[PDB]
């Protein structure tokens, strides 16, 4: 039950706003959402609420966020280093939806409170997909 | 750490194949390399092997990939369903050096053993960019 | 009455609405349908009641279960009677136009619900020769 | 019964030369077979599955009522006749043609029930997504 | 028996195109890969090809390996072995093997399971091969 | 038994030579190496040699040759008849990558004495790929 589930009609009712499709015959995972920032329990249960607005996405575990630039080039950190910044992925078969994922997701946000505010998304497109295993049960 | 530095190599190389710009005055990660499959193990050793030979680039930890699809219809695995393929992703600040990283990732691991040779690559790209953190600490 | 059903007719009639096609021929003949299958039996029996409410003009089969598929690669398939746990069943239309209106709107209905009804699917068919289902006249 | 029926058929089925599988494995074809009684549809069932291991088959089920003979009042689209009906898949859409023209041209020469069995073919515009099997 | 019937089959069909089955030069510069079905009707259409047809060449039925695993995991060793078994005929020239594939498509086609479960294709042989001279032994 | 792994490293070297894709998207087995002549033992090694590195291709067992044409005017052999000359086949997904295989291994074999200089081999192609049953592990 909530978060979670207020969360997810919350974005239920905005991604109703357009109409697009969410599947392709090809099956194949061309387009995601990138989400990070806030604070882990914020990027959480956004997590958890997007998981039951949208079943034909598929979801990455909570991760951390390595650093980015300087400035005063003295010097920058290892590739490796990690920063407490968390994010995860959101796999998507259209790009029209993910674009209106983006939005519905950045309009929910900006209506609440921090951290759950300065929660930050975009798209992203996978030149040649990403074949997640496939499920057999 | 031999394992890795091998890599490393493999990589520079490969990479200097195409003196690319990696690096933009804005400093914006806008481009990916999003790197997956193999096994646990082989898929750090290549993270580890990209973090020395690319100073200029930002890695994420391993992290698991949720399902795809199932075939046919009837149940699908749920969003939040993970699986024990691991995947990282790798943040440029150009397009053009993401696509050079990505065929140098794949002309390595063809030539290398399984599990390493059964990595996927594909480059990916921000629509809005990925604002990762400044460091300092 | 049937809460379940009747929210399911309300989905089918709010997007139906967005094309007032002809739905009937004086002909009365069933030349069209609409093939819905996958989901669960419960669910995919949920729809099939409410779209018995939202379209007196159709006819349906019960559920029934679907055959399996193609077996993968040079190896044994599976007999042609194999039945699969998947059920579906068969809506009977008088006009093509109207069989592809329903199509659209089961569609876009169920995708925008939880699982395992978004796993509902669907498609037209069209039957070269009409089905001609019996006459039915008040028993009773 | 069944086995002279799958002969019956495959004697027919023999006329022509005709692709029953492609290579995408989809079924995008059909023949719709209904009425006669319902044992005198299941033995051709039985009977149509021994002469084409391609095709797939709907277990039997009942038929729902068409229009009212006047007036009406009119049937709801849930009443269900004790007509039967079972459907045939098929990955291409003219060896369901054959096979339509084979299962008329055996029934017409038998006694009623059977001669009262119709078919029809049937086209799904998007194709049917069978469960695969491994199993 | 089950080969003689095979054999026939496969007469009867490769009639309809009376192409060049053999050349002057004698080389073995095409095949039929058959393969699927099961054990036991492989090896009976094996049998039959071999009574239909004297100008080919068959090799015994052997195994073939696994092709890909879906999604990005572990995959099969190049020489794990499946239960399918498959063999290959060798023929002269090329166009007899696109009948040959006809004939016995055509054929399986109309059989039960799992002999219409039977693949096939043509192949071709860049460089041909050198098929052993036969000699009647002492 | 290390007889293999000199034989594998003897082939990752000469097709090296040739930078061509070993997969496609397709992923159907379209093209073959034909391996046969030596020694069944020769043959043997090289299959394994084979094996250990080409990741990507996929083998036959070892069989036996039918025979070809008799000398002269004398009696066909029958179709069964086998030679006592083995064979193995290499199933591959691109035509290119067959070629270089090809190439490599009579380069490989061409230096080695009796019977291993006596393997043959040629590239063959299937009009409609060869359906080599998946693996579900």
Redesign the interface.
């Given at each position: 039950n909530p978060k979670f589930e207020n969360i997810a009609e919350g974005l239920?009712a905005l991604?109703?706003r357009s109409?697009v499709e969410?599947?392709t015959d090809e099956?194949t995972?061309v387009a995601?959402v990138?989400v990070?920032?806030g604070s882990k329990t914020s990027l959480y249960n956004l997590?958890?609420g997007?998981?039951?607005a949208?079943?034909?996405?598929?979801?990455?575990?909570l991760?951390?966020?390595?650093?980015?630039?300087?400035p005063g080039p003295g010097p920058?950190?290892?590739?490796?280093?990690?920063?407490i910044?968390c994010?995860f992925m959101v796999?998507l078969q259209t790009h029209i939806f993910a674009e209106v994922l983006?939005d519905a997701i950045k309009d929910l946000v900006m209506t609440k409170p921090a951290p759950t505010c300065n929660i930050?998304v975009?798209?992203?497109?996978?030149?040649?997909?990403?074949?997640?295993?496939?499920?057999?049960?």
């Open positions: 239920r991604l109703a109409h969410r599947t099956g995972w995601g990138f990070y920032g997590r958890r997007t998981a039951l949208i079943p034909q996405c598929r979801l990455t575990p991760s951390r966020l390595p650093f980015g630039m300087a920058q950190p290892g590739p490796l280093r990690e920063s910044v994010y796999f983006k930050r975009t798209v992203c497109s996978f030149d040649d997909g990403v074949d997640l295993p496939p499920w057999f049960p």
